[PDB]
């Protein structure tokens, strides 16, 4: 549908803290290897002062850490979620449905994505490559969107309301019960993948 309001707010959230975009893509690529990522490793890859890496990360209040303070989750995560993101036989996870559609282009890999419909519990799965989706099951799979909020916890304000559904009508029935969610909208998974492509396009512009 008319997804400009979502594109816009998603970008404002990345652009809100300088360096977030420059750090995101390298971190996603390293996490995609399936192992925890240290702050020092990230500094090395970015050629940034440690102080700089640390400031960006402190603004990203949903970031997940392990027992050593290594990064293990930033959209893409090693900690189990409802969104399975498998790349060459490494099972990783994503914070939400839209993340699984965005990451393949950013890490340059095709992913076997699977979840369950948030309305009915039905299995859903698809193959997401940098350019396209395939093997969409069910064909009519849908995604919920809400509007991102400034200075709100990203996982609790956005990611946790952005689900896969077995169909648009199934998703729309569900949405009619959750109209308190700001900007709640239902789109097809193809529309959501398109939204991810526009996000990624703008993101790569923001980068140095
Ligand atoms: Br609009």
Curated annotation (Swiss-Prot):
GO terms for molecular function: alkylmercury lyase activity. Keywords: Lyase, Mercuric resistance, Mercury, Plasmid. GO terms for biological process: response to mercury ion. It catalyses: an alkylmercury + H(+) = an alkane + Hg(2+). Its EC number is 4.99.1.2. InterPro entries: MerB, MerB_HTH_dom, MerB_lyase_sf, WH_DNA-bd_sf. Cleaves the carbon-mercury bond of organomercurials such as phenylmercuric acetate. One product is Hg(2+), which is subsequently detoxified by the mercuric reductase. NCBIfam families: lyase_MerB (NF033555), PRK13239.1 (NF009710). Belongs to the MerB family. This is Alkylmercury lyase. The lineage of its organism: Bacteria, Pseudomonadati, Pseudomonadota, Gammaproteobacteria, Enterobacterales.
